[PDB]
Amino acid sequence: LIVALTFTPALCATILKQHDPNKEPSNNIFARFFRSFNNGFDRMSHSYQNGVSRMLKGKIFSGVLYAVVVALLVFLFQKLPSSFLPEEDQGVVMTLV
Amino acid sequence: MAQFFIHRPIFAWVIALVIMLAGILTLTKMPIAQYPTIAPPTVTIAATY
Amino acid sequence: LSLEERESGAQAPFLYALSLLIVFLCLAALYESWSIPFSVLLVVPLGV
Ligand SMILES: CCCCCCCCCCCCCCCCCC(=O)OC[C@H](COP(=O)(O)OCCN)OC(=O)CCCCCCCCCCCCCCCCC
């Protein structure tokens, strides 16, 4: 938190350069890989928003999914076996005779 | 405060450098273990008849 | 003291350099410039 409030505002003020106008289009193989990724994430965000709306209007579906997750969480916490600290290969063996 | 450093980038650079310098110096004399000191005390008594 | 003697001497110079670097950094922060602190550091011999 201290760094975010002191160091990073300074670097944002000094290292970033101002050029987002209409003047500059650019074509590069790397550039294509980022434009596609941005389009994909835009699609993802639209789908997320639509799903949020459809979960809002459907209370039964939401509550049921929620209940199911909680039940599986309880069951799994019962089923998982326990231990203290994992066993390692420390390269020595002791025999008792 | 953020506004304060937006205009004194050299001062922020100095703060960062001082922090880093303290830690680099700290590591040179830091102990290295596998775990911290964790075993409890054990006193044993011995006697013969 | 003979056993102690060996360790004491060697470390001393390094701390002067360490001090000098920190003084420069604090001066640079004070003056908001990496240049001016030199004008201050240069007077160090005058004292000695
Ligand atoms: C995409 C690229 C990004 C890459 C970023 C790089 C990583 C940044 C994170 C740096 C933090 C490193 C932390 C190191 C912890 C190591 C833990 C350890 O096991 O210690 C071993 C050792 C201490 O024991 P010993 O072997 O006795 O050595 C001391 C005497 N020589 O340790 C030692 O020998 C002493 C170690 C001193 C620490 C050196 C720190 C290096 C800092 C590099 C940062 C540079 C950042 C650029 C700054 C811009 C400046 C304008």
Cross-chain Cβ contact A13/B1 below 8 Å: no
Hey, how many other C-beta atoms are within 10 angstroms of the C-beta on B5? 21
What was the experiment behind these coordinates?
cryo-EM
Please name the residue of chain B whose CA is at the shortest distance from the CA of residue A15. Answer: B9
Is any atom of ligand 1 closer than 6 Å to the C-beta of B46? no
Residue pair A81/A74 in contact by the 8 Å Cβ criterion? no
Q: Which residue has the tokens 């953020």?
A: B2
Contact A14, B9 (CB under 8 A): yes
In the reported structure, the alpha carbon of residue A53 is separated from the centroid of ligand 1 by a whole-number distance in angstroms of 48
Q: Do A6 and B1 touch (CB under 8 A)?
A: yes
Residues 6+ apart with CB under 8 A from C36: C27, C28
CA separation for the pair A68, A26 (Å, rounded):
49
Residue A33, CB-side half-sphere exposure with 13 Å CA sphere: 3
**Tokens describing residue A97:** 């005779």
- Is A34 an 8 Å CB contact of chain B? no
Structure tokens at B16: 């960062």
Q: In sequence order, which residues have a C-beta less than 8 Å from that of residue C34 and are 6 or more positions away?
A: B10, C28
